[PDB]
Amino acid sequence: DPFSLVADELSLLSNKLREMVLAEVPKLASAAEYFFKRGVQGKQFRSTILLLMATALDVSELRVRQRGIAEITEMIHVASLLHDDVLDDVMGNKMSVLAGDFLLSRACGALAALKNTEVVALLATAVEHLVTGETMEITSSTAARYSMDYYMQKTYYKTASLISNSCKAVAVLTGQTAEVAVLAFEYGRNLGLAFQLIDDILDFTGTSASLGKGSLSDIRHGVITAPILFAMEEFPQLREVVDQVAADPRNVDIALEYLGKSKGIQRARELAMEHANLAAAAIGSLPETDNEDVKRSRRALIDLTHRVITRNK
Amino acid sequence: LDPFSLVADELSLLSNKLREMVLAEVPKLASAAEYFFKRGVQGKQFRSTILLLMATALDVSELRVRQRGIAEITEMIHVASLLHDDVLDDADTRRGVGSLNVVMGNKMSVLAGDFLLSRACGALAALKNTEVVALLATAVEHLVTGETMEITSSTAARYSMDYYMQKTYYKTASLISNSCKAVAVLTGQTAEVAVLAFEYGRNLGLAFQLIDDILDFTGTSASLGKGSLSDIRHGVITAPILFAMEEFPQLREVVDQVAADPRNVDIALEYLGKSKGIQRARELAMEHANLAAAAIGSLPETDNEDVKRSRRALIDLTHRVITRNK
Ligand SMILES: CC(C)=CCC/C(C)=C/CC/C(C)=C/COP(=O)(O)OP(=O)(O)O
Ligand SMILES: CC(C)=CCC/C(C)=C/CC/C(C)=C/COP(=O)(O)OP(=O)(O)O
Ligand SMILES: C=C(C)CCSP(=O)(O)OP(=O)(O)O
Ligand SMILES: [Mg+2]
Ligand SMILES: [Mg+2]
DSSP: OHHHHTHHHHHHHHHHTOSSSSTTSSOOHHHHHHHHHSSOSOOOHHHHHHHHHHHTSOOOHHHHHHHHHHHHHHHHHHHHHHHHTOOOOOOOTTHHHHHHHHHHHHHHHHHHHHTOHHHHHHHHHHHHHHHHHHHHHHSOOHHHHTOHHHHHHHHIIIIIHHHHHHHHHHHHHTTOOHHHHHHHHHHHHHHHHHHHHHHHHHHHHOOSSSOSSOOOHHHHTTOOOHHHHHHHHHOTTHHHHHHTTTTOTTHHHHHHHHHHTSSHHHHHHHHHHHHHHHHHHHHHTSOOOOOHHHHHHHHHHHHHHHHHHHOOO | OOTTTTTHHHHHHHHHHHHHHTOOSSHHHHHHHHTTTSTTOSOOOHHHHHHHHHHHHSOOOTTHHHHHHHHHHHHHHHHHHHHHHHHTTTOSEETTEEOHHHHTOHHHHHHHHHHHHHHHHHHHHHTTOHHHHHHHHHHHHHHHHHHHHHHHSOHHHHTSHHHHHHHHIIIIIHHHHHHHHHHHHHTTOOHHHHHHHHHHHHHHHHHHHHHHHHHHHHOSSSSTTOSOOHHHHTTOOOHHHHHHHHHOTTHHHHHHTTTTOTTHHHHHHHHHHHSSHHHHHHHHHHHHHHHHHHHHHTSOOOOOHHHHHHHHHHHHHHHHHHHOOO
């Protein structure tokens, strides 16, 4: 019973080798050092929109609660990021689960503190859609992965639902009408779709900080985005190239050549502009005001619908 | 008039209600979310049982549907924990069946849980009562605080009855107390009556856990060693052991070194044996069980026979929670 024969010494060792616990329990301090350092924390794009929207609607404790929704939204965003990191593929995805749950529980806590069940419903739906989108991203009929309509549903759940429902939440907290609320929702929904679509293009285009030659992150990892989906309508031969990207990694470069002879990038950007225009229409349709701060915010919101398209970063 | 049988059919109604409530396309998300809600794999539905009985106990089917909601939300919250719990605590078994983290993977388990939480908030919103939203949000915060304590605390912290008492409340009794309070609040009972419903849930929950911790050691039969000892094998340190450490300090290094040397399981049982640990744990549980019964006793007098029958069964659980042979 070999293990039984040397238990004495095993425990001396097992004990000693708890030098990694104890000593080195701090020097989590790396964790704190790493968090500050990151490359962000965030650009605060969702927060910017939400604070602007709060101002952009005619109506302190209210401004405190409105910011409450920007706070909740960030909490919900990071929790979804973390849970999406939970790997099936040492594994660190116990950290992601615990941290995600702390943020979600804090979100619930803060939703409860708003004392508005209608906004609770909106962020509840937001959470459900994020979860739905991620399931869609992971599981999928091979056929499904190649449908532009499916991609756009998935894109809506993953990227636009959180922001649309938050924009609507800000409307509802501010006591706006059902018809104004549906405007703020539509601003977020449409701006969000545009933002993601521009993100998809930037992966292939690159950036000024980029080489400047796209990182190609999506296509390396078999994530199929709008430009490539559009390019497959033109070149059916491309379906085969994209499939064989893992098997043979030079199929990335070949995919790139197809895209460059196609209207894929153009068609994704034209779709983004269509969405961004619709967002600016939503602000345009907002009830007339005389307030200068309010009108300044609405101009900003509309400005954001232009800057989202022309992003080089 | 038996409390489980007295509520059994509404539990099946709730059971089926949960199934549509948890339904979702995408289908893969549906498989995951529904997994612990089908006939046979719902668990013993003790939280629901207490809630339906409590619902009747407080009284005067327009409002009952709302009260049922609380049991459904509570069950959804509950199952959400388990799913997340199984990814942590790295299980392969739950409810006599493959756990979701083995069957469907870690990712689906965690998404299913988030899904169930959001449906729970959804249903909480639909009830349009802000105090009820806050009561169940507290419960969710408490679950996370409690799960975190069971993991995170340093060694010196974990080995006191104070710590155990807090962790148990957050991890186990908070869901029962707050949902008990919510049921009461939904009926627009005075603030004081809501507290009575809260003290009941709180004390019954704490008493249930104490007895469960003892049964790990004793088992079906009364004496020591018949039980599975699953907690102490894995290095979970429940009340019997903690009380024993009050008598025998040297037991701390023994229990702390259990994982490394599984022969330290036997040494700990010898220490438990000489101690009054099992006994004091029981004595604590009997004290909680008392306060629970006492709370129901302070409820306002009623004429209704169906109410009395239901009040008597909540008390019956007060005795049964101590008595449970298993
Ligand atoms: C729903 C959602 C996620 C919406 C996005 C919100 C939004 C439009 C954020 C701002 C984007 C922006 C101004 C980028 C600047 O890049 P740049 O290269 O244009 O820098 P520059 O404008 O200073 O030249
Ligand atoms: C709302 C949500 C998703 C919260 C996450 C926090 C979390 C994982 C809580 C777990 C609470 C719980 C029921 C523990 C019991 O499991 P046990 O291991 O003590 O005993 P058991 O596995 O046999 O139930
Ligand atoms: C505090 C309680 C009454 C707990 C019992 S819940 P428990 O996890 O034991 O039971 P299930 O739902 O069957 O898994
Ligand atoms: Mg477990
Ligand atoms: Mg646990």
